[PDB]
Symmetry: D3
């Protein structure tokens, strides 16, 4: 039905969790969902629909980077009628305000990409999440006793930065971490009148300088997963 | 002291309400504050300290445009130890999602200014308010029976726009109204680790050409003033 | 009549002096003009008309920053038919060629604002004054024996710069001082086919760190004020 | 070994073929490569090593967009010591000079990404392939009776473009087709002193809206796979 | 001594006239100077020294475009000690206020070049002439009976514009004509603390679409030549 | 017929060699062409037509910098029907891989000019030569026993750089040398559907500190001249 998703129209629930990693999506379906069905698998980018403790949710992989993320989110909204999108990914810490393990809620996503300038009159689009979703996250995290760190992230076109000298400046301006997709998710959701939010877990520390294995990036962040499932349930 | 404020160190309370118009500031002190004292008046830009329901509150004018607002906000934080800054004003609505008398909570401020590019590595800074402050506005509005319109505003360097043809695109991307300062207030507060939020009253609709009568303008601004004072108690 | 000026349509003389500070404007009206009338006071931004040595002249406050200055200058030209606009402001010296209280005529106003890029095809607009006003300032200063310094100024969106490391480069390219409005004045007068010039007196010296008090910024510049009045005769 | 590749150093041969779709990578391994072995599978992004006409060749998936392709290419060169990278993909034709089923050698990759301005002093990096590899492709195509179409491609951050009105201009400047990775592959190989080339098969015509059937796409893709393997052996 | 000038250090007088065309330079030496000596001829770019009414004056060709003009003016100031540089060039009028053969004094040179952004912090440099020279031109034109038209020029990288639709906008903002060098002459003299002015004679009218016809462009601009020689005398 | 060329239509052969220096063009005409005729001479920018091994070839000066090169290339293609344009210029080496008098073939021309962003939607145009011409150069160089170095060049608006600290980064990205016209030649040829290529001989080595005299820049590069004539045969 679209070039990158081979689900039937109607296979997605209106609420969808997203990860860049399709194997994290697969792990979520197996560990937390019942009656789960793989609904799409083009380019190995898996998506699922199932029940979290009796309530329907969908999961979808979005690949790495703003261009990849934009592709999947565009199709989810425009073709698959998805209304609420919650990214739960990984990020690299740069700020003294946060530590490893920490879950960050991104109230803004700054970027070194040109995509928002192309979208938005070559001006500065402030890429932001839906407020209702951010409120629901905060309240749920409180209810569950999960100490959520709240601020900006910086969404980069680079995993391997050319601007490591600038991390302190970013931290000063309340950038808690760097990842590579939130500004894409936020701008696409704004374009298309949908509700989006990004949470991310600090697996890696860019200034100290720890890094999780590929396996730990799938398996270490059950608290963030539970937060997402609970807030969309 | 500073070139633009003649208050004594210690004259400002840590929480301050801000408006563009120093006569709106004056109006607030004269009507709503107990023991209101004028604390500064350089360039006729007035500021006050007083009490509301037993709580110390300051008020400060910030003039028009990001550059003017930045001066005042920088001085308030760095010299006068202001920690929480709540800006209230009118705007020009550009979205069908809002109408006359609506109060907007600006969860992002986009801009055509170069100021955030200068501050932030020539990249896109997502200028955002403090989350706790925004949560405090939402909960207070709920208590007061105000239905907050939440979304982005666009902060322009132009009152008389050369890009009116772009207003529908702005509205498409969840910009509910146009004003001239919020992106500056937000960036400055991000730079300086202070808590900021902007609320805007819809007095004019730039698309529908709706405009409130001079009397209902006084009544609607009073409603927004009450919201703000209630938030700072 | 306009949102920012409440003068009647023939209240301004075609020749108008401008200061960002409405209290310097008030000072000038009281000390130097006969039959001076306050003609506007919206947002506490004062303007006056009266006579100097028999000839009508107007005075108008323009606030701080290009965005503020543009609002006022646009309205003075379009609504009030002002033909000649002479800013007599303050600036921060960055060259040893000038000292505290020196008078500078800006033959060009460079800028870190995006406003002229937005106005002018995303190209470089060289913001410049009317040559005949500049000629008249030079000749009037020689006659009065006031030694006018002549060169570029840099019109910034920042009073508190993030680029102090660049001030030497700006001084190398013949920028004598930094102020915040000249580029906006010049571009607005260019757009609207009006005659403009900016003079500024040095109120801050960024080499020497000496800075005037707010009161001194009103009172210390009679030579600049007399120069301005004399060139309008 | 890296966050995105779980192969051991020594697993990749120094020549590697790249495709965006890891299922395409799998197909090539299963049909064309002797002793095909899966060597990486992080995020479902498959990579393989095996032999073609006696020559060791590796295959690696790179995902969609410049940011994703940059991650994988950086790690293949800097960790896995890959020296020669040949990307083969589909593209959307924009030029009258090409049509469906044509194979394009990209001698330049233009872009709407900011990545190369970030890499390269905010100037214009002309992102180009290694000349000797491009010569090898030309000679191998002639030998195989492939009428190789040669020109620029335009590497976009957008699959769903906001600038379809510009496709004719891009075609005028010798952009034969649009894809989403070549500028990244080229700039990364330039940075890291590796040899890279991108070939792409026209699967869709973005002007006429004609498109190959799924069967027709696999058949045209096979010709390009043979070209790539033959030039690497 | 330089790659572009084969004059000996000391061959140039400190006052030098400049044209893009070395054959205009030749014409001036032969018609207006006594004891003229050709002092440089690298790339056929002729320069001369001679006498006008007993005073030493030099002449130098500078080719077309900001980059060519910058080469020669940098060399003249830095190697050859030239102190005063007066360009007497040709331009294409975009204003109704000017006609064929009118002389324009450029009080500002706008540009579509990136050169000034490269030189000046990526901001807007207002490229302007030395005020004393401009005063000297104005007084000398007055004494001679020459009607000097005064305003900005637009210095383009394009003789054959891609933006002819924008000539009306350029004219609105007080650009009387388009040429290709003034912004570079002015920026280089500002860099290097030298005095520079640009005069240009209208050879082409781009609005009325009228032009001088080769014959004709030779003795056409004697008013400008003499004005220049008189101001250096 | 054009303001910059006074040749008659049909005076140019369809294959043209180009140098910035019209005296190098003159040298080539006298030393290597039979029955050579000077065909144009406007602004001392010479051009010729003659025969090599009985085949017609033309030669044209293009001056210095992209704006100048663009003027002449535009006129040669549009008015004079020139189909194949071969720049044989000079350049400043920034890589250890090349020495004084080495011949570089530019497979891309990076730039600090704004010209290609003006041309190309504010995006990155990858400025590249015609492939068949580059193939011809390579094969012809083999035939002659000339060792042709191949890679990118950086086309600057500056001979005297403000970014000398960036040379090592340009070299890292496979820029062998800096010159000032190739990106303009390439973009113009791309715009007008013509075949172009740039070869340049090293006249300055910016790393080792060699620099040829003006005479050497005319006379030292017979190998490059012979290569160019033989490739047009």
């Amino acid at each position: 039905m679209t070039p990158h998703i081979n689900a039937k129209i109607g296979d997605f629930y209106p609420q969808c969790l997203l990860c860049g990693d399709p194997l994290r999506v697969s792990y979520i379906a197996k560990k937390f969902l019942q009656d789960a069905k793989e609904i799409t698998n083009v380019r190995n980018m898996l998506g699922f629909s199932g029940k979290y403790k009796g309530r329907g949710i969908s999961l979808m992989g979005h690949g790495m980077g703003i261009a990849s993320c934009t592709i999947y989110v565009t199709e989810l909204i425009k073709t698959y009628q998805v209304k609420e999108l919650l990214r739960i990914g990984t990020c690299g810490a740069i700020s003294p305000k946060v530590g490893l393990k920490d879950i960050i809620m991104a109230t803004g996503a700054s970027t070194d990409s040109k995509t928002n300038r192309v979208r938005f009159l070559n001006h500065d689009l402030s890429a932001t999440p839906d407020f209702e979703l951010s409120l629901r996250a905060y309240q749920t995290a409180k209810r569950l006793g999960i100490d959520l760190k709240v601020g900006n992230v910086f969404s980069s076109d680079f995993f391997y930065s050319f601007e490591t000298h600038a991390f302190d400046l970013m931290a000063k301006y309340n950038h808690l971490a760097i990842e590579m997709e939130a500004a894409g998710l936020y701008a696409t959701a704004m374009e298309l009148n949908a509700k989006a939010l990004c949470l991310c877990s600090v697996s890696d520390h860019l200034i100290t300088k720890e890094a999780l294995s590929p396996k730990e990036r799938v398996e270490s962040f059950d608290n963030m997963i539970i937060l997402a499932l609970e807030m969309m349930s």
